[PDB]
mmCIF file of all heavy atoms in Angstrom:
data_model
loop_
_atom_site.group_PDB
_atom_site.id
_atom_site.type_symbol
_atom_site.label_atom_id
_atom_site.label_comp_id
_atom_site.label_asym_id
_atom_site.label_seq_id
_atom_site.Cartn_x
_atom_site.Cartn_y
_atom_site.Cartn_z
ATOM 1 N N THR A 1 -38.520 129.291 -98.793
ATOM 2 C CA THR A 1 -38.069 129.089 -97.416
ATOM 3 C C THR A 1 -37.057 130.114 -96.982
ATOM 4 O O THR A 1 -36.257 130.618 -97.787
ATOM 5 C CB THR A 1 -37.505 127.641 -97.268
ATOM 6 O OG1 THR A 1 -37.167 127.375 -95.904
ATOM 7 C CG2 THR A 1 -36.291 127.367 -98.078
ATOM 8 N N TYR A 2 -37.095 130.465 -95.675
ATOM 9 C CA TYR A 2 -36.156 131.388 -95.104
ATOM 10 C C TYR A 2 -36.198 131.211 -93.603
ATOM 11 O O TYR A 2 -37.176 130.660 -93.060
ATOM 12 C CB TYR A 2 -36.500 132.862 -95.488
ATOM 13 C CG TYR A 2 -37.687 133.408 -94.776
ATOM 14 C CD1 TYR A 2 -37.509 134.200 -93.662
ATOM 15 C CD2 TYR A 2 -38.982 133.122 -95.160
ATOM 16 C CE1 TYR A 2 -38.588 134.683 -92.930
ATOM 17 C CE2 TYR A 2 -40.092 133.591 -94.419
ATOM 18 C CZ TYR A 2 -39.871 134.349 -93.293
ATOM 19 O OH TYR A 2 -40.886 134.806 -92.509
ATOM 20 N N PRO A 3 -35.161 131.654 -92.892
ATOM 21 C CA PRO A 3 -35.119 131.594 -91.430
ATOM 22 C C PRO A 3 -35.837 132.761 -90.790
ATOM 23 O O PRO A 3 -35.539 133.904 -91.149
ATOM 24 C CB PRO A 3 -33.623 131.618 -91.104
ATOM 25 C CG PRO A 3 -33.035 132.461 -92.216
ATOM 26 C CD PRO A 3 -33.881 132.115 -93.426
ATOM 27 N N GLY A 4 -36.713 132.506 -89.833
ATOM 28 C CA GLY A 4 -37.402 133.613 -89.161
ATOM 29 C C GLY A 4 -37.894 133.273 -87.784
ATOM 30 O O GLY A 4 -37.228 132.588 -87.026
ATOM 31 N N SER A 5 -39.072 133.805 -87.495
ATOM 32 C CA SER A 5 -39.533 133.860 -86.099
ATOM 33 C C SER A 5 -40.989 133.449 -85.998
ATOM 34 O O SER A 5 -41.724 133.409 -86.958
ATOM 35 C CB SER A 5 -39.367 135.285 -85.550
ATOM 36 O OG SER A 5 -40.353 136.190 -86.041
ATOM 37 N N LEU A 6 -41.404 133.264 -84.727
ATOM 38 C CA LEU A 6 -42.823 133.286 -84.428
ATOM 39 C C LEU A 6 -43.370 134.657 -84.809
ATOM 40 O O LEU A 6 -42.673 135.678 -84.679
ATOM 41 C CB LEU A 6 -43.038 133.108 -82.933
ATOM 42 C CG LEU A 6 -42.604 131.769 -82.388
ATOM 43 C CD1 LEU A 6 -42.793 131.772 -80.846
ATOM 44 C CD2 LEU A 6 -43.240 130.628 -82.992
ATOM 45 N N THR A 7 -44.646 134.733 -85.257
ATOM 46 C CA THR A 7 -45.231 136.007 -85.647
ATOM 47 C C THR A 7 -46.063 136.636 -84.552
ATOM 48 O O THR A 7 -46.650 137.689 -84.773
ATOM 49 C CB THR A 7 -45.980 135.946 -86.925
ATOM 50 O OG1 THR A 7 -47.195 135.211 -86.710
ATOM 51 C CG2 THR A 7 -45.173 135.357 -88.079
ATOM 52 N N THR A 8 -46.142 135.970 -83.397
ATOM 53 C CA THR A 8 -46.808 136.503 -82.225
ATOM 54 C C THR A 8 -45.811 136.458 -81.102
ATOM 55 O O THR A 8 -44.883 135.614 -81.090
ATOM 56 C CB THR A 8 -47.999 135.670 -81.837
ATOM 57 O OG1 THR A 8 -47.641 134.290 -81.701
ATOM 58 C CG2 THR A 8 -49.115 135.802 -82.839
ATOM 59 N N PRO A 9 -45.953 137.354 -80.105
ATOM 60 C CA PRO A 9 -45.146 137.254 -78.871
ATOM 61 C C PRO A 9 -45.128 135.812 -78.376
ATOM 62 O O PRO A 9 -46.195 135.183 -78.327
ATOM 63 C CB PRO A 9 -45.855 138.232 -77.938
ATOM 64 C CG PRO A 9 -46.330 139.333 -78.871
ATOM 65 C CD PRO A 9 -46.869 138.504 -80.030
ATOM 66 N N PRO A 10 -43.976 135.260 -78.020
ATOM 67 C CA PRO A 10 -42.701 135.992 -77.735
ATOM 68 C C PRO A 10 -41.786 136.253 -78.934
ATOM 69 O O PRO A 10 -40.648 136.678 -78.713
ATOM 70 C CB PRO A 10 -42.040 135.064 -76.680
ATOM 71 C CG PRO A 10 -42.512 133.674 -77.111
ATOM 72 C CD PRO A 10 -43.967 133.859 -77.503
ATOM 73 N N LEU A 11 -42.212 135.973 -80.154
ATOM 74 C CA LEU A 11 -41.477 136.454 -81.373
ATOM 75 C C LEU A 11 -40.097 135.770 -81.474
ATOM 76 O O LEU A 11 -39.209 136.313 -82.116
ATOM 77 C CB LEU A 11 -41.391 137.965 -81.435
ATOM 78 C CG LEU A 11 -42.713 138.694 -81.473
ATOM 79 C CD1 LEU A 11 -42.503 140.182 -81.308
ATOM 80 C CD2 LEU A 11 -43.512 138.441 -82.746
ATOM 81 N N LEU A 12 -39.967 134.571 -80.919
ATOM 82 C CA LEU A 12 -38.685 133.912 -80.848
ATOM 83 C C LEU A 12 -38.228 133.524 -82.245
ATOM 84 O O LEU A 12 -38.984 133.093 -83.109
ATOM 85 C CB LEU A 12 -38.766 132.651 -79.971
ATOM 86 C CG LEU A 12 -39.064 132.995 -78.507
ATOM 87 C CD1 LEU A 12 -39.390 131.731 -77.751
ATOM 88 C CD2 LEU A 12 -37.909 133.732 -77.801
ATOM 89 N N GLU A 13 -36.911 133.656 -82.454
ATOM 90 C CA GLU A 13 -36.281 133.416 -83.738
ATOM 91 C C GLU A 13 -35.809 131.989 -83.856
ATOM 92 O O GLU A 13 -34.613 131.627 -83.822
ATOM 93 C CB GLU A 13 -35.135 134.441 -83.967
ATOM 94 C CG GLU A 13 -35.699 135.835 -84.070
ATOM 95 C CD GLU A 13 -34.698 136.952 -84.264
ATOM 96 O OE1 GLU A 13 -33.497 136.774 -83.861
ATOM 97 O OE2 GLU A 13 -35.092 138.045 -84.720
ATOM 98 N N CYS A 14 -36.794 131.102 -83.995
ATOM 99 C CA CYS A 14 -36.670 129.659 -83.912
ATOM 100 C C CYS A 14 -37.292 128.919 -85.078
ATOM 101 O O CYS A 14 -37.408 127.703 -84.984
ATOM 102 C CB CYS A 14 -37.272 129.116 -82.582
ATOM 103 S SG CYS A 14 -39.059 129.461 -82.473
ATOM 104 N N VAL A 15 -37.667 129.634 -86.134
ATOM 105 C CA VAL A 15 -38.506 129.020 -87.188
ATOM 106 C C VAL A 15 -37.793 128.903 -88.504
ATOM 107 O O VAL A 15 -37.287 129.898 -89.044
ATOM 108 C CB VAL A 15 -39.826 129.802 -87.390
ATOM 109 C CG1 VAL A 15 -40.669 129.183 -88.459
ATOM 110 C CG2 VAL A 15 -40.594 129.976 -86.104
ATOM 111 N N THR A 16 -37.814 127.715 -89.105
ATOM 112 C CA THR A 16 -37.602 127.568 -90.563
ATOM 113 C C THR A 16 -38.979 127.683 -91.222
ATOM 114 O O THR A 16 -39.840 126.836 -91.025
ATOM 115 C CB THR A 16 -36.939 126.204 -90.918
ATOM 116 O OG1 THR A 16 -35.715 126.066 -90.216
ATOM 117 C CG2 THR A 16 -36.749 126.147 -92.376
ATOM 118 N N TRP A 17 -39.170 128.784 -91.935
ATOM 119 C CA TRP A 17 -40.418 129.002 -92.643
ATOM 120 C C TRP A 17 -40.437 128.283 -93.950
ATOM 121 O O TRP A 17 -39.448 128.376 -94.729
ATOM 122 C CB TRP A 17 -40.652 130.529 -92.863
ATOM 123 C CG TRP A 17 -41.208 131.192 -91.653
ATOM 124 C CD1 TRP A 17 -40.564 131.846 -90.657
ATOM 125 C CD2 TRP A 17 -42.585 131.145 -91.298
ATOM 126 N NE1 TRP A 17 -41.441 132.199 -89.678
ATOM 127 C CE2 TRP A 17 -42.691 131.799 -90.036
ATOM 128 C CE3 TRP A 17 -43.729 130.648 -91.861
ATOM 129 C CZ2 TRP A 17 -43.883 131.958 -89.381
ATOM 130 C CZ3 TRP A 17 -44.942 130.814 -91.243
ATOM 131 C CH2 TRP A 17 -45.032 131.472 -90.019
ATOM 132 N N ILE A 18 -41.562 127.635 -94.272
ATOM 133 C CA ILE A 18 -41.773 126.983 -95.559
ATOM 134 C C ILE A 18 -43.128 127.512 -96.042
ATOM 135 O O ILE A 18 -44.150 127.119 -95.476
ATOM 136 C CB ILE A 18 -41.770 125.459 -95.387
ATOM 137 C CG1 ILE A 18 -40.393 125.015 -94.829
ATOM 138 C CG2 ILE A 18 -42.103 124.769 -96.703
ATOM 139 C CD1 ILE A 18 -40.356 123.577 -94.384
ATOM 140 N N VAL A 19 -43.109 128.416 -97.006
ATOM 141 C CA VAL A 19 -44.329 129.071 -97.454
ATOM 142 C C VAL A 19 -44.683 128.539 -98.825
ATOM 143 O O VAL A 19 -43.887 128.656 -99.753
ATOM 144 C CB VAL A 19 -44.171 130.585 -97.468
ATOM 145 C CG1 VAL A 19 -45.431 131.264 -97.971
ATOM 146 C CG2 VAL A 19 -43.830 131.100 -96.085
ATOM 147 N N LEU A 20 -45.853 127.928 -98.961
ATOM 148 C CA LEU A 20 -46.259 127.314 -100.223
ATOM 149 C C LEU A 20 -46.616 128.433 -101.239
ATOM 150 O O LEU A 20 -47.268 129.415 -100.930
ATOM 151 C CB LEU A 20 -47.431 126.379 -100.019
ATOM 152 C CG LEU A 20 -47.170 125.148 -99.204
ATOM 153 C CD1 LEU A 20 -48.348 124.146 -99.310
ATOM 154 C CD2 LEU A 20 -45.875 124.440 -99.514
ATOM 155 N N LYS A 21 -46.202 128.185 -102.474
ATOM 156 C CA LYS A 21 -46.505 129.084 -103.594
ATOM 157 C C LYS A 21 -47.991 129.134 -103.946
ATOM 158 O O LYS A 21 -48.513 130.168 -104.309
ATOM 159 C CB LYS A 21 -45.585 128.710 -104.751
ATOM 160 C CG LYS A 21 -45.951 128.854 -106.214
ATOM 161 C CD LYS A 21 -45.228 127.837 -107.164
ATOM 162 C CE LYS A 21 -46.132 126.862 -107.856
ATOM 163 N NZ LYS A 21 -47.082 126.376 -106.832
ATOM 164 N N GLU A 22 -48.638 127.968 -103.887
ATOM 165 C CA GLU A 22 -50.010 127.892 -104.345
ATOM 166 C C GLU A 22 -50.955 128.127 -103.199
ATOM 167 O O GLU A 22 -50.908 127.419 -102.178
ATOM 168 C CB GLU A 22 -50.298 126.512 -104.945
ATOM 169 C CG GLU A 22 -51.671 126.362 -105.576
ATOM 170 C CD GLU A 22 -52.014 124.865 -105.939
ATOM 171 O OE1 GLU A 22 -51.161 124.102 -106.215
ATOM 172 O OE2 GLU A 22 -53.153 124.326 -105.760
ATOM 173 N N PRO A 23 -51.840 129.122 -103.307
ATOM 174 C CA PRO A 23 -52.855 129.335 -102.297
ATOM 175 C C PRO A 23 -53.967 128.292 -102.359
ATOM 176 O O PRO A 23 -54.145 127.635 -103.380
ATOM 177 C CB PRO A 23 -53.465 130.690 -102.608
ATOM 178 C CG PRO A 23 -53.388 130.726 -104.105
ATOM 179 C CD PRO A 23 -52.029 130.052 -104.412
ATOM 180 N N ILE A 24 -54.685 128.141 -101.245
ATOM 181 C CA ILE A 24 -55.978 127.461 -101.264
ATOM 182 C C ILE A 24 -57.097 128.468 -101.402
ATOM 183 O O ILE A 24 -56.903 129.651 -101.044
ATOM 184 C CB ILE A 24 -56.179 126.525 -100.082
ATOM 185 C CG1 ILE A 24 -56.178 127.286 -98.754
ATOM 186 C CG2 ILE A 24 -55.135 125.412 -100.074
ATOM 187 C CD1 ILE A 24 -56.695 126.465 -97.571
ATOM 188 N N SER A 25 -58.220 128.063 -101.961
ATOM 189 C CA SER A 25 -59.414 128.902 -102.040
ATOM 190 C C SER A 25 -60.387 128.499 -100.947
ATOM 191 O O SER A 25 -60.639 127.308 -100.737
ATOM 192 C CB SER A 25 -60.081 128.772 -103.436
ATOM 193 O OG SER A 25 -59.227 129.268 -104.470
ATOM 194 N N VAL A 26 -60.985 129.484 -100.311
ATOM 195 C CA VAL A 26 -62.067 129.320 -99.332
ATOM 196 C C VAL A 26 -63.213 130.175 -99.774
ATOM 197 O O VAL A 26 -63.019 131.180 -100.473
ATOM 198 C CB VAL A 26 -61.618 129.638 -97.883
ATOM 199 C CG1 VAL A 26 -60.438 128.786 -97.533
ATOM 200 C CG2 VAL A 26 -61.304 131.129 -97.713
#
């Protein structure tokens, strides 16, 4: 986890990101 932004315009810095370690397979 880290503090960041939307990844598309308007790119606002309003996000607590929670990125899972384990990928899913498709």
Side-chain angles (χ1 to χ4, degrees):
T1 185
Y2 73 98
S5 75
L6 295 176
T7 72
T8 53
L11 300 171
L12 295 169
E13 295 179 335
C14 63
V15 180
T16 303
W17 279 95
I18 299 169
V19 178
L20 293 192
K21 149 208 116 316
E22 185 190 331
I24 63 166
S25 296
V26 304

